[PDB]
Amino acid sequence: GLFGAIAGFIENGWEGMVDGWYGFRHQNSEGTGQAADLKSTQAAIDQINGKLNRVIEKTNEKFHQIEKEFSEVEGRIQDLERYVEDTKVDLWSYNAELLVALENQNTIDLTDSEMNKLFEKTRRQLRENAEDMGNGCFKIYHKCDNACIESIRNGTYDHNIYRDEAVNNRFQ
């Protein structure tokens, strides 16, 4: 993908996470866990649904048209009837090939965006109290328990509180 998060610096996906598309797996003093992140999981499920018939009509409704099969050879006029259809079918057949190829490139890109934007909403919160390991996990350099993590996840985490202690465990 274009940012190179999904199948990029992140090796893998978590076949357990039956609660969301993105989220967090923490490892601390008390143990571990795993929780969905609804704000950026909704942002993909709203972009991917309003992308379907943003471009196709309320299913066009047609009635009496031209005949498209023939019992008898007739020449010029039927040549023209057949060619008119053949011409249309090849254009819709291309339009629908290209439609999908573009939508699929975009779907795949907008998700690889949503992952790498969670990573840099988060990297920005943890500020200087931690480090980008380079595998999608940060190493937190302080005592961080079940309400310290939960304050990150719900985007209210206060970095000042742990600022000195975390510069400590880091460089001493």
Partner: protein
């Protein structure tokens, strides 16, 4: 406990799907969806469109009134289904520009027939024939009227019928081409007839053409069929000295969503907007691979049997 580890990531699945993008012919994904409809229950749902099963009758024979199509008099349809096994069983005929007569009637969506008091002075009405029987008895197209001689003369017919209505009238009529001159004169006295139907704005004149044609239901003559439309305020005028096969009236013309389809699919009670000759189809998907021929609210025919749209992200187990 003086450090922790926070990990960000994404979901995945055991068995995910392959799709195509601008930059991989194939690439794995978590969910996907099929945009092309490629199957059909094989039945034609009789709702919300009014389906009319022609059975043993083609729309033109129903139109004209082949005795075995009498059940279809004054009928109407959104969709006329014509059946491959249909046959004719009346005097043999042709329709110069049949395809068009068929189309225009199919689109009108009605066979409502209004009889009109044509005065045919000096001739015999209600000719019948051995090609067109009603049980054991000799008969003819219900909507047409075979005018033969009376006495030993056939005068020059000259009639008219104005349109004081606010719809168009479709008049159907024909000309009889006999096989031997014995027949020409045995019926119309004159040597070579002529038929001239006209309006203020148009006309058609047809000379018959004596001669033998392959034999059909014991007959080697033929009736050729023709139509005249007469607009409100216009007039109709029929003028002939023999061979006229006359109309009894007119067909109401309509404007609307009506058409005709050839199919051998059976009719069911169900609901389906989209109809194909192969049977009905769901119209949820934008495309379809069942038939370029359709009727109703239908996906777009394309060539592909499958197209997969990604409904989820890239999948790495």
């Amino acid at each position: 406990n003086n450090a922790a580890t926070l990990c960000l990531g994404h979901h995945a699945v055991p068995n995910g799907t392959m799709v195509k993008t601008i930059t991989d012919d194939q690439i794995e994904v978590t969910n996907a969806t099929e945009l092309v409809q490629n199957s059909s229950t094989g039945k034609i749902c009789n709702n919300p469109h009014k389906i009319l099963d022609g059975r043993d009758c083609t729309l033109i024979d129903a139109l004209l009134g082949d005795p075995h199509c009498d059940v279809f008099q004054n009928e109407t349809w959104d969709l006329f289904v014509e059946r491959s096994n249909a046959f004719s069983n009346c005097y043999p005929y042709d329709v110069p520009d049949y395809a068009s007569l068929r189309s225009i009637v199919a689109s009108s969506g009605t066979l409502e027939f209004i009889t009109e008091g044509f005065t045919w002075a000096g001739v015999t009405q209600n000719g019948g024939s051995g090609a067109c029987k009603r049980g054991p008895a000799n008969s003819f197209f219900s909507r047409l009227n075979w005018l033969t001689k009376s006495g030993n003369t056939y005068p020059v017919l000259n009639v008219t019928m104005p349109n004081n209505n606010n719809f168009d009238k479709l008049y159907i009529w024909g000309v009889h081409h006999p096989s031997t001159n014995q027949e020409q004169t045995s019926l119309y006295i004159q040597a070579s007839g002529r038929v001239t139907v006209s309006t203020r704005r148009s006309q058609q004149t047809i000379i018959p053409n004596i001669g033998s044609r392959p034999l059909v239901r014991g007959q080697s003559g033929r009736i050729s069929v023709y139509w005249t439309i007469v607009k409100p305020g216009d007039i109709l005028v029929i003028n002939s000295n023999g061979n006229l096969i006359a109309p009894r009236g007119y067909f109401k013309m309509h404007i609307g969503k009506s058409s005709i389809m050839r199919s051998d699919a059976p009719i069911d009670t169900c609901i389906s907007e989209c109809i194909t000759p192969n049977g009905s189809i769901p119209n949820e998907k934008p495309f379809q691979n069942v038939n370029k021929i359709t009727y109703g609210a239908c996906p777009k025919y394309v060539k592909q049997n499958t197209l997969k749209l990604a409904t989820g992200m890239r999948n790495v187990p």
